[PDB]
Amino acid sequence: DFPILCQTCLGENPYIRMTKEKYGKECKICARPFTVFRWCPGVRMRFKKTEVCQTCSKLKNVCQTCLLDLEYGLPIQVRDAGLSFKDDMPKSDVNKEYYTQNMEREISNSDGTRPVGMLGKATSTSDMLLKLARTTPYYKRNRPHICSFWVKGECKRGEECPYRHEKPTDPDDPLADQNIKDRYYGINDPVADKLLKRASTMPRLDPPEDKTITTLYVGGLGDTITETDLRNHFYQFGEIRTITVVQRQQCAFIQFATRQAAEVAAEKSFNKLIVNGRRLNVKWG
């Protein structure tokens, strides 16, 4: 009873009518019958319905319809590229059936609210994916499918047509093909790969222009801030060597015992840290 859901599926209305079938469909993964839920998300929306059984969601920690993580809204291949691939799960036939069975007993014996072993891992995060995690609901995802009479030029329902009248996606784009099983296991997922390419460009971690340099060239200081903000932020890292301050261009230089600590302060800092409700931007030299 009650599905497991994204906030993005469930709807942008707080009031929702949602129907239930006892054994509605096989799950497209572990292939068992399971309680299925439909509901209307919104005014122009599509009537989504749960695609996979609740168990294999608890297993990989995901929405039932979307298969996007609960916290990050990221396809599974991504958050695995983000932490731990070694979760695994047999893809192969009768194994899948077997492992699902056992893991279904293991889950039965848990407190109920926890994605099994992954959650022991799931706490430690934020490497990148937080910064590539999506922020707001994305409703373009629930729109009705593309009317396929109209996309041949004919559709004779006129304005009534609940489907959507517009140009489809060119089958050329590798982002088209998108199997379900595939998106689930984290194989060759085009979306996930795209997000990976997007991850790399994040100006961030390579640093190291020069050896031993712990000099921090800090842009976007501002004249509200004091140094004491700086120190009481940065004593976490280690033994400071010193701090140079310039308020004429509002840039603050810093120096630490080891370069390692400076890299760190970059990492922890870059395009993340803000104090005095004002962004504190960092660069090398």
Binding site: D88, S92, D93, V94
Partner: peptide
Amino acid sequence: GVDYNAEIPFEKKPALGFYDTSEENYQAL
């Protein structure tokens, strides 16, 4: 057919006990 040569038939990842198995990996043939 692929329950053998593709994907490890049924998998029991060994249970983990008071020691570190993280590091260990093994060589090819």
